[PDB]
Amino acid sequence: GKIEEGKLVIWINGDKGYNGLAEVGKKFEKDTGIKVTVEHPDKLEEKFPQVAATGDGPDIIFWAHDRFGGYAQSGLLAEITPDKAFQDKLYPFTWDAVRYNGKLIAYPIAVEALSLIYNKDLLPNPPKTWEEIPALDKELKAKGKSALMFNLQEPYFTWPLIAADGGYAFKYEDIKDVGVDNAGAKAGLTFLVDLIKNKHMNADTDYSIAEAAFNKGETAMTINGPWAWSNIDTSKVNYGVTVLPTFKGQPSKPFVGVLSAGINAASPNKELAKEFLENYLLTDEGLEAVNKDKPLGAVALKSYEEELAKDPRIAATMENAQKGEIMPNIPQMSAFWYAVRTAVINAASGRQTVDEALKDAQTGSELYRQSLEIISRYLREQATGAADTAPMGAGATSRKALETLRRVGDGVQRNHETAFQGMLRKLDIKNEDDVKSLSRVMIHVFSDGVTNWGRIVTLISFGAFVAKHLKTINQESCIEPLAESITDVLVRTKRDWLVKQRGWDGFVEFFHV
Ligand SMILES: C[C@@H]1CN([C@@H](C)C(=O)O)C(=O)c2cccc(NS(=O)(=O)c3ccc(F)cc3)c2O[C@@H]1CN(C)C(=O)Nc1ccc(C(F)(F)F)cc1
Ligand SMILES: OC[C@H]1O[C@H](O[C@H]2[C@H](O)[C@@H](O)[C@@H](O)O[C@@H]2CO)[C@H](O)[C@@H](O)[C@@H]1O
Ligand SMILES: [Mg+2]
């Protein structure tokens, strides 16, 4: 492969303690004579799947657990199998965070949650509510200070407020149940936008700007995670870490992340990586080395957390964590975060109204599951000649899109039968490994669009054609992964177009009779 044998390359995000991680690398190198190299590439969570998909990249990838399901689904991660004894050294719920389809796909490192960080000298008694921050800002502005600055370019930081009065991603209690554009999410975002309209915050504020303003004592509060504490320590600001403000009497609910370490599927150094992570990093001295660089939060290792738990900053971190929720690791978490990122930025800048912004994010977030429901049902009923008698769920969009697809797809399949026959024969889709090869082909072709619903119908119709063939040669098991592959290709390459058409509602209206 392209990844070098007998070395370790490790990627971790630039806001984490990568210099501390390098020391742990240095110790490994001392013992074994094996080179360890730590990098913190920009846009890491985007860069890794790009390079790993070609069998390249780092041996070890660090990120919060939410992205790892997508990585694993794309075949980019090796299954990890720690022995029972190592497993028992970490909290079971941190292992739960890195389980995907019944398999462990990463080592959990530390539990991260946002807290309210405040300047004790400016604000001895920080607000318990979001609602009182406008008035507090006015009071502080008279002194040449502002109340609150935090990163508005990443939805992670705004999510706690969105979730406060009822917003949610995928319902936890149902991936078909998405609460990005309900009244609670709209109330939360609207409050944020009003703060901006009323000059209490600035839409342009990002991570660097907010951090600088807090650490220079210009703003009384910021919202951030444990990794940020080291820089505040250096600035000598007298800070406290506390519970996030409530909104409409309800706690802010941060999405909780577990910093995790995955092993590249393409790495020839999986045994080396295992050794490094289990017996160097995930020890008291290993985690201390990283934690002393940038604080990890509440670590997964039971022994070392027993000490860190005494830190009131950690207690505050876990208080906020318990009021929030552990992130899902389903493959469309990335699409969810992109949708909401755009919604927050657009609402904050005035490019969209809050309502229209969150509507788009709802559609974006639901896009994979909605598309899969339609495409899977269509391919299956086409292959077997009979519909699925199971209930749709939410909602009328699926039923109407499927009705439309059946009606339009009938003519498309009749007219394209000869073409489909030739393409099926040209390719050789005979099993599930052939389905993967088709995806790579489709990704290349479908970026040359030029998108309309007719082309999408032709693609799905070819899918149905192939599905029929797979049933005929007794490979009915291949139909669902075919549907997933086409769905993945479609929603990935035509995401923006699909959201612009209002998703499958646009499909139904376009072909309305
Ligand atoms: C018909 C030829 C066959 N072919 C030739 C060049 C060739 O080189 O063989 C393709 O490369 C080709 C390859 C894979 C998919 C498809 N397309 S297809 O699935 O609809 C199809 C499959 C089999 C057929 F017989 C006819 C259409 C391919 O089409 C192309 C035409 N083409 C450029 C296109 O269909 N583009 C497109 C479709 C959907 C979407 C989207 F994303 F909006 F859905 C975007 C772009
Ligand atoms: O803003 C969306 C973003 O949120 C989370 O990323 C966090 C990460 O978990 C933290 O470790 C820290 O680095 O801040 C990040 C936000 O800038 C999700 O983990 C990530 O997938 C998502 O894109
Ligand atoms: Mg819209």
Side-chain angles (χ1 to χ4, degrees), residues 1-25 28-29 31-34 36-42 44-171 174-175 177-198 200-291 293-305 308-321 323-424 427-429 431-435 437-438 441-442 444-447 449 451-491 493-499 501-512:
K2 331 183 64 59
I3 299 178
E4 293 196 58
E5 297 178 16
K7 308 184 183 183
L8 282 183
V9 174
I10 306 176
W11 293 1
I12 188 166
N13 207 40
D15 56 8
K16 306 312 190 303
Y18 53 81
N19 284 316
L21 184 53
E23 296 183 39
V24 182
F28 185 84
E29 192 176 273
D31 281 352
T32 63
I34 300 300
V36 175
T37 303
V38 176
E39 309 268 3
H40 53 289
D42 296 302
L44 178 56
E45 77 281 20
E46 304 177 1
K47 183 66 172 175
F48 172 76
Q50 287 172 2
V51 296
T54 68
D56 213 346
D59 299 280
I60 299 175
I61 172 77
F62 283 74
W63 194 264
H65 74 289
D66 60 301
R67 298 240 165 204
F68 277 65
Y71 297 164
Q73 190 61 41
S74 298
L76 311 177
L77 296 178
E79 183 181 9
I80 76 156
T81 39
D83 80 313
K84 189 171 190 65
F86 181 84
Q87 211 156 326
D88 291 343
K89 282 179 179 55
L90 317 189
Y91 294 103
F93 80 92
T94 68
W95 284 115
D96 293 340
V98 290
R99 201 172 290 104
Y100 182 74
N101 277 4
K103 293 170 177 175
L104 295 171
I105 45 73
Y107 292 88
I109 306 296
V111 180
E112 307 176 344
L114 297 169
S115 289
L116 184 66
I117 303 166
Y118 68 104
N119 187 321
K120 296 180 172 179
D121 293 335
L122 297 179
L123 205 67
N125 200 87
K128 289 295 186 183
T129 75
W130 280 92
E131 285 93 339
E132 74 201 88
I133 291 177
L136 176 64
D137 185 67
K138 181 169 168 178
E139 187 70 35
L140 283 166
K141 284 287 173 59
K143 317 170 185 290
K145 307 294 174 177
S146 67
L148 176 67
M149 296 184 65
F150 65 97
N151 182 9
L152 303 183
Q153 310 310 312
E154 289 291 342
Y156 182 70
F157 297 87
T158 289
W159 191 255
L161 171 58
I162 286 167
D165 190 48
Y168 54 88
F170 308 90
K171 187 75 182 181
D174 194 356
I175 309 180
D177 188 349
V178 180
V180 168
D181 75 335
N182 64 24
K186 286 176 181 166
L189 189 46
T190 292
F191 193 86
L192 185 87
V193 175
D194 282 340
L195 283 175
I196 297 177
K197 287 184 184 170
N198 292 324
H200 302 306
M201 289 194 316
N202 191 308
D204 292 327
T205 298
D206 59 15
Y207 193 94
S208 286
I209 294 170
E211 168 179 60
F214 185 82
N215 293 1
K216 282 157 64 178
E218 294 181 346
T219 192
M221 300 179 278
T222 185
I223 292 176
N224 222 324
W227 54 85
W229 299 338
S230 285
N231 286 348
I232 309 177
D233 286 349
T234 296
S235 74
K236 292 317 200 312
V237 166
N238 182 19
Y239 73 108
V241 179
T242 191
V243 63
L244 292 155
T246 63
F247 177 61
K248 288 168 88 287
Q250 309 295 131
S252 297
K253 306 169 173 55
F255 255 140
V256 173
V258 182
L259 180 66
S260 311
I263 294 169
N264 198 322
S267 171
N269 304 307
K270 298 191 184 66
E271 289 299 321
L272 286 178
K274 168 178 186 181
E275 171 76 3
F276 173 81
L277 291 168
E278 294 191 7
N279 302 318
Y280 288 78
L281 176 61
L282 280 168
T283 62
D284 288 349
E285 63 274 355
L287 294 182
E288 175 175 34
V290 181
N291 196 69
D293 186 356
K294 302 286 180 71
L296 294 161
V299 300
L301 185 69
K302 290 172 177 165
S303 56
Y304 188 45
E305 177 56 16
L308 296 189
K310 298 167 177 315
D311 189 341
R313 299 176 302 173
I314 300 291
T317 300
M318 292 298 101
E319 181 179 354
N320 283 307
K323 304 190 167 185
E325 282 189 3
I326 303 280
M327 289 189 284
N329 64 1
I330 61 179
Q332 63 261 54
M333 277 307 286
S334 174
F336 157 76
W337 279 126
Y338 186 94
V340 177
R341 177 181 297 114
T342 298
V344 171
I345 282 163
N346 284 0
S349 70
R351 180 170 180 181
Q352 283 178 297
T353 67
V354 169
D355 286 6
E356 290 303 311
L358 286 181
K359 179 61 161 47
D360 285 350
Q362 175 80 10
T363 295
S365 300
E366 286 181 325
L367 195 51
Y368 179 78
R369 187 65 200 86
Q370 179 66 264
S371 302
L372 176 58
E373 186 69 53
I374 299 161
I375 292 167
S376 173
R377 282 191 186 249
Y378 187 63
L379 267 56
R380 274 185 276 108
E381 71 183 26
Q382 282 280 305
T384 64
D388 189 330
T389 54
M392 288 288 180
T397 297
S398 290
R399 171 169 42 74
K400 285 183 167 185
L402 185 55
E403 183 279 336
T404 301
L405 180 53
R406 295 161 169 173
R407 168 164 49 82
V408 178
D410 193 78
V412 167
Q413 250 191 90
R414 165 178 55 85
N415 288 118
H416 287 263
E417 197 188 343
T418 296
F420 287 175
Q421 284 170 356
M423 180 68 52
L424 171 56
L427 318 166
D428 209 38
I429 315 188
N431 46 50
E432 189 181 343
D433 223 20
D434 291 321
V435 170
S437 175
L438 179 67
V441 168
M442 287 184 300
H444 170 55
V445 179
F446 297 164
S447 63
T451 320
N452 54 41
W453 287 114
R455 280 185 158 193
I456 293 175
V457 173
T458 300
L459 162 65
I460 295 169
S461 295
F462 180 57
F465 184 86
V466 173
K468 293 175 175 179
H469 171 64
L470 292 164
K471 187 211 172 62
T472 297
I473 63 171
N474 199 26
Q475 296 282 335
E476 242 195 270
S477 74
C478 287
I479 295 175
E480 191 57 28
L482 177 63
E484 293 176 338
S485 180
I486 296 173
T487 299
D488 171 84
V489 163
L490 177 60
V491 306
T493 65
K494 306 301 189 176
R495 169 195 76 199
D496 291 339
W497 190 86
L498 289 162
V499 167
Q501 317 305 318
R502 296 179 294 106
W504 288 98
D505 291 338
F507 173 70
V508 172
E509 292 175 17
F510 182 76
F511 286 115
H512 171 75

